[PDB]
Amino acid sequence: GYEVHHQKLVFFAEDVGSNKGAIIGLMVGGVVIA
Amino acid sequence: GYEVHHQKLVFFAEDVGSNKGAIIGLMVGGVVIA
Amino acid sequence: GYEVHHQKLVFFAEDVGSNKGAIIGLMVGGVVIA
Amino acid sequence: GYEVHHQKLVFFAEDVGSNKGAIIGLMVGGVVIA
Amino acid sequence: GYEVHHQKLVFFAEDVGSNKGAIIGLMVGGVVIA
Amino acid sequence: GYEVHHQKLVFFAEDVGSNKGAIIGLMVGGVVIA
Numbered sequence: 001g002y003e004v005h006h007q008k009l010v011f012f013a014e015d016v017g018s019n020k021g022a023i024i025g026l027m028v029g030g031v032v033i034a
Numbered sequence: 035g036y037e038v039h040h041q042k043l044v045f046f047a048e049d050v051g052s053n054k055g056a057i058i059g060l061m062v063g064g065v066v067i068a
Numbered sequence: 069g070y071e072v073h074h075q076k077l078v079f080f081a082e083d084v085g086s087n088k089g090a091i092i093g094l095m096v097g098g099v100v101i102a
Numbered sequence: 103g104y105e106v107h108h109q110k111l112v113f114f115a116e117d118v119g120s121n122k123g124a125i126i127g128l129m130v131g132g133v134v135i136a
Numbered sequence: 137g138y139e140v141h142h143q144k145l146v147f148f149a150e151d152v153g154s155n156k157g158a159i160i161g162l163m164v165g166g167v168v169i170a
Numbered sequence: 171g172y173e174v175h176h177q178k179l180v181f182f183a184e185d186v187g188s189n190k191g192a193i194i195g196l197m198v199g200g201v202v203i204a
Contacts, residue, residue: 001035001036001069001070002035002036002037002069002070002071003036003037003070003071003072003073004037004038004039004041004072004073004201005037005038005039005040005041005072005073006040006041006042006073006074006075007040007041007042007072007073007074007075007076007199007201008041008042008043008044008074008075008076008077009042009043009044009076009077009078009165009198009199010043010044010045010047010076010077010078010079010081011044011045011046011059011078011079011080011093012045012046012047012048012079012080012084012093013044013047013048013078013080013081013082014047014048014080014081014082014083014084015048015049015050015051015083016046016048016050016051016053016057016083016084016085016087017050017051017052017083017084017085017086018051018052018054018085018086018087019050019052019053019054019055019057019084019087020054020055020068020086020087020088021055021056021068021087021088021089021090021091021102022055022056022058022066022068022089022090022091022092023055023056023057023058023084023087023091024056024058024059024061024066024090024091024092024093024095025045025046025058025059025060025079025092025093025094026059026060026061026093026094026095026164026198027058027060027061027092027094027095027096027098028061028062028063028096028097028098028111028145028162028196029062029063029064029096029097029098029109029111029143029145029179030061030062030063030064030065030066030097030098030109030111031065031066031098031099031100031101031106031109031140031143032065032066032068032090032092032098032099032100032101032102033065033066033067033068033101033102033104033106033138034055034066034067034068034088034089034090034100034101034102036203038167038201038203041165041167041199041200041201043131043164043165043198043199043200048083055087060130060164062111062128062162063109063111063145065106065109067104077199094198096145096179096196097143097145097177097179098143098145099140099143099174099177101104101138101140101172103137103138104137104138104139105138105139105140105141106140106141107140107141108141108142108143109140109141109142109143109144110142110143110144110145111144111145111146112144112145112146112147112149113146113147113148113161114147114148114152114161115146115148115149115150116148116149116150116151116152116185117151118151118152118153118155119151119152119153119154120153120154120155121152121155122154122155122156123155123156123157123158123159123170123189124157124158124159124160125152125155125159126158126159126160126161126163127147127160127161127162128161128162128163129160129162129163129164129166130164130165130166131164131165131166132165132166133166133167133168133169134158134160134166134167134168134169134170135169135170136156136157136158136168136169136170137171137172138171138172138173139172139173139174139175140174140175141174141175142175142176142177143174143175143176143177143178144176144177144178144179145178145179145180146178146179146180146181146183147180147181147182147195148181148182148186148195149180149182149183149184150182150183150184150185150186151185152185152186152187152189153185153186153187153188154187154188154189155186155189156188156189156190157189157190157191157192157193157204158191158192158193158194159186159189159193159194160192160193160194160195160197161181161194161195161196162195162196162197163194163196163197163198163200164198164199164200165198165199165200166199166200167200167201167202167203168192168194168200168201168202168203168204169203169204170190170191170192170202170203170204
């Protein structure tokens, strides 16, 4: 008998403002210029 | 007997404002210019 | 009998402001220029 | 002056045979039973 | 002047055979039973 | 003047056979039972 619950995963937990660049949460491969 | 529940995954948990760039949550391959 | 719960994983727990570069949370492979 | 080219991303580069389960390349959310 | 090229990212570079379980390349969130 | 090229990232470079469990390459969050 097992029980897994209430795990929680966040990437940004605060409002982003006035961005002008490249804000990515998860990136597999690929290039970013900024 | 198993039981998995109430897992939770967020990428942005705060309102975004005045953006001018590239805000991506998950990106597989691909280029980004900003 | 096991019980795993309430684990929590954050990448940014504070609002980002006035960004102009490359803010990435998790990056597998891939290049970044900034 | 920038130049990005010839990036390449593969998920399975070899022929699959005699499958009987769940072969997924990329999965966001969602459950899999097999 | 920059130049990024010929990056390469693979997940499985060998043919899979006689599978009976759950073969996933990339999985964000979500449960897997096997 | 910069030059980045020919980077290479593999997860499985050998054919998988007779699997019966959960073979994942990259997993963000989420549970696995096997």
